[PDB]
């Protein structure tokens, strides 16, 4: 009746594991920058969608908004940042993250790390954030481990 979800966000590496199986892993240098998004079925944990939005670059946040608005309210939503996800995370995307209940997403800053697990229509199940301490530095790697409830009946 529960999914064991692990989410890792850092300068050079992201991964997501569900029930001990890696469903997303990107450790490639110079690739996969931005916010990675995984959508899971809320009864089985099966992956319904996997995306990466390079929100360090213009226009990617608009694509993230259009994608997230089509996710059904019951789904499990997982986000994790690789390298930099804030430079072009603009106000409409931040407001959408705030509407999910995210505390750190709407405040994401330069080279911060961020891992998030929650139900599309609320509530948030787990969230971790590390603020970069200097423009030349990154946030500390964050490893979020969250038990996500499953729907049934
Ligand atoms: O020449 N520039 O305008 C310029 C130089 C460096 C820069 O930041 C560096 O950090 C980014 C975010 O961490 C990385 O994604 C890039 O690989 C980049 O090398 C951004 C712009």
Swiss-Prot record:
Effect of residue 111 to A: Decreased enzyme activity. Impairs protein stability
Residues noted as binding a carbohydrate in the record, renumbered to the chain: 33, 83, 111
Subcellular location: Golgi apparatus membrane
Tissue: Constitutively expressed. An additional weaker band is also detected in spinal cord, lymph node, and trachea. Expressed especially in astrocytes. Also expressed in immature and mature neurons.
Highest rank taxon of the organism: Eukaryota
Effect on the protein upon substituting residue 24 to R: In RP76; no effect on protein abundance; reduced acetylglucosaminyltransferase activity
Effect after changing residue 33 to A: Decreased protein stability. Decreased enzyme activity
Residues of the GG-type lectin domain: 1-153
Assembly behavior: Interacts with DAG1 (via O-linked mannose moiety). Interacts (via transmembrane domain) with FKTN; the interaction is direct and is required for normal location in Golgi membranes.
Disease entry from the Swiss-Prot or TrEMBL record: Muscular dystrophy-dystroglycanopathy congenital with brain and eye anomalies A3: An autosomal recessive disorder characterized by congenital muscular dystrophy, ocular abnormalities, cobblestone lissencephaly, and cerebellar and pontine hypoplasia. Patients present severe congenital myopia, congenital glaucoma, pallor of the optic disks, retinal hypoplasia, intellectual disability, hydrocephalus, abnormal electroencephalograms, generalized muscle weakness and myoclonic jerks. Included diseases are the more severe Walker-Warburg syndrome and the slightly less severe muscle-eye-brain disease.
Known function: Participates in O-mannosyl glycosylation by catalyzing the addition of N-acetylglucosamine to O-linked mannose on glycoproteins. Catalyzes the synthesis of the GlcNAc(beta1-2)Man(alpha1-)O-Ser/Thr moiety on alpha-dystroglycan and other O-mannosylated proteins, providing the necessary basis for the addition of further carbohydrate moieties. Is specific for alpha linked terminal mannose and does not have MGAT3, MGAT4, MGAT5, MGAT7 or MGAT8 activity.
Record remark on domains: Amino acid residues between 299-311 are important for both protein expression and enzymatic activity. The minimal catalytic domain is located between positions 299-651. Single amino acid substitutions in the stem domain from MEB patients abolished the activity of the membrane-bound form but not the soluble form. This suggests that the stem domain of the soluble form is unnecessary for activity, but that some amino acids play a crucial role in the membrane-bound form. The GG-type lectin domain is known as the stem domain in POMGnT1. It mediates specific interaction with beta-linked N-acetylglucosamine moieties of O-glycosylated proteins. It also interacts with its product, N-acetyl-beta-D-glucosaminyl-(1->2)-O-alpha-D-mannosylprotein.
Family: Belongs to the glycosyltransferase 13 family.
Protein name: Protein O-linked-mannose beta-1,2-N-acetylglucosaminyltransferase 1
Provenance organism: Homo sapiens (Human)
Designated gene of the protein: POMGNT1
